[PDB]
Swiss-Prot record, chain A:
Identified in a complex composed of RYR2, FKBP1B, PKA catalytic subunit, PRKAR2A, AKAP6, and the protein phosphatases PP2A and PP1. Interacts directly with RYR2. SUPFAM superfamilies: FKBP-like (SSF54534). It comes from Homo sapiens (Human). The lineage of its organism: Eukaryota, Metazoa, Chordata, Craniata, Vertebrata. The keyword Cytoplasm applies. Its EC number is 5.2.1.8. One of its GO terms (cellular component) is membrane. Belongs to the FKBP-type PPIase family. FKBP1 subfamily. This is Peptidyl-prolyl cis-trans isomerase FKBP1B. Transmembrane segments: none annotated.
Curated annotation (Swiss-Prot), chain B:
Belongs to the ryanodine receptor (TC 1.A.3.1) family. RYR1 subfamily. Detected in skeletal muscle (at protein level). Fast- or slow-twitch skeletal muscle. Homotetramer. Can also form heterotetramers with RYR2. Identified in a complex composed of RYR1, PDE4D, PKA, FKBP1A and protein phosphatase 1 (PP1). Repeated very high-level exercise decreases interaction with PDE4D and protein phosphatase 1 (PP1). Interacts with CALM; CALM with bound calcium inhibits the RYR1 channel activity. Interacts with S100A1. Interacts with FKBP1A; this stabilizes the closed conformation of the channel. Interacts with CACNA1S; interaction with CACNA1S is important for activation of the RYR1 channel. Interacts with CACNB1. The chain holds residues 631 to 1647 of 5037 of the full protein. The calcium release channel activity resides in the C-terminal region while the remaining part of the protein constitutes the 'foot' structure spanning the junctional gap between the sarcoplasmic reticulum (SR) and the T-tubule. Pore opening is mediated via the cytoplasmic calcium-binding domains that mediate a small rotation of the channel-forming transmembrane regions that then leads to channel opening. It comes from Oryctolagus cuniculus (Rabbit). It comes from the Eukaryota. Residues 1-168, 378-559, 654-796 form the B30.2/SPRY domain. Sequence repeats lie at residues 211-319, 320-419. Changing residue 414 to S: Decreases protein stability. Changing residue 426 to W: Decreases protein stability. This is Ryanodine receptor 1. The lineage of its organism: Eukaryota, Metazoa, Chordata, Craniata, Vertebrata.
Length: 107, 872
């Protein structure tokens, strides 16, 4: 279950399809309020291909429901993103992940 | 467990001079309305988002400091229980975000109008965005204080204010019963845009200010015998005198005698005489004369009756041909030109005029009137319904010249009448000097209580600056030096003078120079303090009183020093920062009390961590060292433990099986003999608690009740946010037995029940899913033995050491590690001024656009997070 709560409105007609790149200037957080990732401290936007299983399952089912220029807030459940062993050193096991994704250009 | 770092933005806060309060006697309306229209917001100027919320706050609590605070950082509106923020889709109060269900939910985009409704008669604070109301309001809040509009913006935000019709243009019409916010401005003040709790103000030559004296809660309220026969006959003679004085000025400006009464036609019905006045005019004068002598001996001034022959020898004043009116009849008032008023009577004529309007303000408030800037007779609003110290000088002089008439004629008849805290601005401890000769200066913009000099780096902010042996300081208001007492020295200050301070560590002498002139004492000595030890060193210190303003030029530039070459250069003294590439950082004192551990060598309180026997669990005690005579300090101290407990993020919704699967924890305290249980408050404290008052009670506890429903009007949820979740010990019970107050928490359901002596009570509390709670006991010591934190385990519930530590979650034995100590809330603490503040542009642009405000400078800083106290 991915809960997509919007933050700023977008275009509402351009949505990502298969085999298409996206650029996403996200910043990820935990449930407690501690930030574990940001793509704006590096000033380099994250770019990924949809459908080829680069990102986690919660990220792409989260990025597919948005529009161009829309900025939303996801709450990825721990079942869909790093369930048992997690990522060692960053995210504790069985932790809820929150993402403030923003799609800049190209669907 | 370890310290975290992140880059956080800077935020400000600006208010107008619109304070709204309610009391027993409330002279304001109580329900107001204002609008805020945004026009330009950058979404992401830096890596963190631009923080922008809108709402109200109170006076004494909302102190947004630029460096440090609660949470990770960037504290503004909504980050405490004192302020109420709204960003478009979150209702911020108490540093927890509540998401709303509003049509078209988004952030505060440009070209948006956000409105804030307020009512104090019943607590309710509503918000409507772009003419559509939101489904979330704040109720059951505390009203001990005054409310004012606050916005808090990060870098890259321009926003306009819409306070009233005279200052702006309301794009939406207010609801019926909500007055515009421009009417509650006081007559002694014009509407300004100012920051809150400031310490740095930029000037032509940066000026350091003191704490502002804001308005009190009971300052807006107005505050209020037999009569002997020797003064009962003079009440008619004074009443005809005032009617003769009223008819004299009325004929002088243009009123005439007539049967009908008209102001525009200038008709006066009582212009002939006092007996020619009608009966409701006559008895009104005598009750008003009966009131003003009723308050005359009510202040305590003694009157006597003498020299009756000299009063009868006094005639009426001379009236010329131009003095008599068009009817042919003139009043003949008593001449008071032989009698001159003394300043003792000048102080009493202000006190009688103060008592006359405050009894007029209370009776109009009892009728049902209120105050506004406009004068609306059918709306029950009149602009002079403020107390006498908040009334303008035009109305204050008008009633004093009207009451100076009645005093000097009664004096002409022979009757004789008988008569927050303090800020400390010091430099950093890495710039302390040990040798050589150093000089700095201090300009005084506003005269008053300011103390400048040199102090050692081990200076405590709790003591008054100059009453201890840690500073050699010179006070300039009454002209005396302060070091282990007081002694007169030099001259008093004026407004606009520079005070030069030189130290010389080679001869151990300090010289104070006021405006280039070397100040001498009464004995003739030019040096002020002699034979001072070096020790740990000296650093320049500066104190400013309440409301005072003055910059401390430490002497970084040589040409910026005004009186350096006149005195203090050829003697050998050098400026402080003569070769420094960056400006000197200053460490200033806070008035926000923060928790910190008890010192081991404290003369009044001490603790002792006692070990656990087979009968008594491992426990710790506080005992008063000096309870009897010899400088005993008995004031209410607030004690808190060092580690919090953390509730589980999702709620649930003896035998070894029941102890390993339970999530409920217990701790108790035992109140000793001789300690009265009325002064004992036991429970839990959530970390944003910064109230240190010696008159603490559970009614003086911040509580905010948020109710958010659907668009139909029915509610969906009700959450109460408080910082102090405790109970009173006097409700449970020379007591010879000991009172045991226990606390029960369930981390799965979030339910807290309080037990006393093995009996459960009627109270219950529910918390947020993500919160932390500190076990605290607030107590006033009325014995040598006060309290005792006992971390014991009951029959089937684990002690508190399992919830606070992860290694001992499954060990049920009670332990007391040295990381568990007790804290105490000292009222002051040391923090550091930042070197670059946010530059704000305040300017009114047009009468319909409103007051515009903007900042564009990007600023970031790094800070520690410290997760066990959630304080940056």
């Amino acid at each position: 279950g991915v809960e997509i709560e919007t933050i700023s409105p977008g275009d509402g007609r351009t949505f990502p399809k298969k085999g298409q790149t996206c650029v996403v200037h996200y910043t990820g957080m935990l449930q407690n309020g501690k930030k574990f990732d940001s793509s704006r401290d590096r000033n380099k936007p994250f770019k990924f291909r949809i459908g080829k299983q680069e990102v986690i399952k919660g990220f792409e089912e989260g990025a597919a429901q948005m529009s161009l220029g829309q900025r939303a807030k996801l709450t990825c459940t721990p079942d869909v993103a790093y369930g048992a062993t997690g990522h060692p050193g960053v995210i504790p096991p069985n932790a809820t992940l929150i993402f403030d994704v923003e799609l800049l250009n190209l669907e | 467990l370890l310290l975290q770092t992140n880059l956080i933005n800077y935020v400000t806060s600006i208010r107008p001079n619109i304070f709204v309060g309610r009391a027993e006697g409330s002279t304001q309306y109580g329900k107001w309305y204002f609008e805020v229209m945004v026009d330009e917001v950058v979404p992401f100027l830096t890596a963190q988002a631009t923080h922008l919320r809108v709402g109200w706050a109170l006076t004494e609590g909302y102190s947004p400091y630029p460096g440090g605070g609660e949470g990770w950082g960037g504290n503004g509106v909504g980050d405490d229980l004192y302020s109420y923020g709204f960003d478009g889709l979150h209702l911020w109060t108490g540093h927890v975000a509540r998401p709303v269900t509003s049509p078209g939910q988004h952030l505060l985009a440009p070209e948006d109008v956000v409105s804030c409704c307020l009512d104090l008669s019943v607590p309710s604070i509503s918000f409507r965005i772009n003419g559509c109301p939101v489904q979330g309001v704040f109720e059951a809040f505390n009203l001990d204080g005054l409310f004012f509009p606050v916005v808090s913006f990060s870098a890259g935000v321009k926003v306009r204010f819409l306070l009233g019709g005279r200052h702006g243009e309301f794009k939406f019409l207010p609801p019926p019963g909500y007055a515009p916010c421009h009417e509650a401005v006081l007559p002694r003040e014009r509407l300004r845009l100012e920051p809150i709790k400031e310490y740095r103000r930029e000037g032509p030559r940066p000026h350091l200010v003191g704490p502002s004296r804001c308005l009190s809660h009971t300052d807006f309220v107005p505050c209020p015998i037999v009569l002997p026969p020797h003064l009962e006959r003079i009440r008619e003679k004074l009443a005809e005198n005032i009617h003769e004085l009223w008819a004299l000025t009325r004929i002088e400006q243009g009123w005439t005698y007539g049967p009908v009464r008209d102001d525009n036609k200038r008709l006066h019905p009582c212009l002939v005489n006092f007996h020619s006045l009608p009966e409701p005019e006559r008895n009104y004068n005598l009750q008003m004369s009966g009131e003003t002598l009723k308050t005359l001996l009510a202040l305590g001034c003694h009157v006597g009756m003498a020299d009756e022959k000299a009063e009868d020898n006094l005639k009426k004043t001379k009236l010329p041909k131009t003095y008599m009116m068009s009817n042919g009849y003139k009043p003949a008032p008593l001449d008071l030109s032989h009698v001159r008023l003394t300043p003792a009577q000048t102080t009493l004529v202000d006190r009688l005029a103060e008592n006359g309007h405050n009894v007029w303000a209370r009776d109009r408030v009892a009728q049902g009137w209120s105050y506004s800037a406009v004068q609306d007779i059918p709306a029950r609003r009149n602009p002079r319904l403020v107390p006498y110290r908040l009334l303008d000088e035009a109305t204050k002089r008008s009633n004093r010249d009207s009451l100076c008439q009645a005093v000097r004629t009664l004096l002409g008849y022979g009757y004789n009448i008988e008569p927050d805290r303090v800020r400390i601005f010091r430099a950093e401890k890495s710039y302390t000097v040990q040798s050589g000769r150093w000089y700095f200066e201090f300009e005084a913009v506003t005269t008053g209580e300011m103390r400048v000099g040199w102090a050692r780096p081990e200076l405590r902010p709790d003591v008054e600056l100059g009453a201890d042996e840690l500073a050699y300081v010179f006070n300039g208001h009454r002209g005396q030096r302060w070091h282990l007492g007081s002694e007169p020295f030099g001259r008093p200050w004026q407004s606009g003078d520079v005070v030069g301070c030189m130290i010389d560590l080679t001869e151990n002498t300090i010289i104070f120079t006021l405006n280039g002139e070397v100040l001498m004492s009464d004995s003739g000595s030019e040096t002020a303090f002699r034979e001072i030890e070096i020790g740990d060193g000296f650093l320049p210190v500066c104190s400013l009183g309440p409301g005072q303003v003055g910059h401390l030029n430490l002497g970084q530039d040589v040409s910026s020093l005004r009186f350096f070459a006149i005195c203090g250069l050829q003697e050998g003294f050098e400026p402080f920062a003569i070769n420094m590439q960056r400006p000197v950082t200053t460490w200033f004192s806070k008035s926000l009390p923060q928790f910190e551990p008890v010192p081991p060598e404290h003369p009044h309180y001490e603790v002792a961590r006692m070990d656990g026997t087979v009968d008594t669990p491992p426990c710790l005690r506080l005992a008063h060292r000096t309870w009897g005579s010899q400088n005993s300090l008995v004031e209410m101290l607030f004690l808190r433990l060092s580690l919090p407990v953390q509730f589980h993020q999702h709620f649930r919704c003896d035998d070894p099986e029941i102890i390993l699967n339970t999530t409920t924890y217990y701790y108790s305290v035992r109140v000793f003999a001789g300690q009265e249980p009325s002064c004992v408050w036991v429970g839990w404290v959530t970390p944003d608690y910064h109230q240190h008052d010696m008159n603490f009670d559970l009614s003086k506890v911040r509580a905010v009740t948020v109710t958010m429903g659907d668009e139909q009007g029915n509610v969906h949820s009700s959450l109460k946010c408080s910082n102090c979740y405790m109970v009173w010990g006097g409700d449970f019970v020379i007591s010879h037995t000991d009172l045991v107050i226990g606390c029960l928490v369930d981390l799965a359901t979030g339910l807290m029940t309080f037990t006393a002596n093995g009996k459960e009570s009627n109270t219950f509390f529910q918390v947020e899913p993500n919160t932390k709670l500190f076990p605290a006991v607030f107590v006033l010591p009325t014995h040598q033995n006060v309290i005792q934190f006992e971390l014991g385990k009951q029959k089937n519930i684990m002690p508190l050491s399992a919830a606070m530590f992860l290694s001992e979650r499954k060990n049920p034995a009670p332990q007391c590690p040295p990381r568990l100590e007790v804290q105490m809330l000292m009222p002051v603490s040391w923090s550091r001024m930042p070197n670059h503040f946010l530059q704000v542009e305040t300017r009114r642009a047009g009468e319909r656009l409103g007051w515009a405000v903007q900042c564009q400078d990007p600023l970031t800083m790094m800070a520690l997070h410290i997760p066990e106290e959630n304080r940056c």
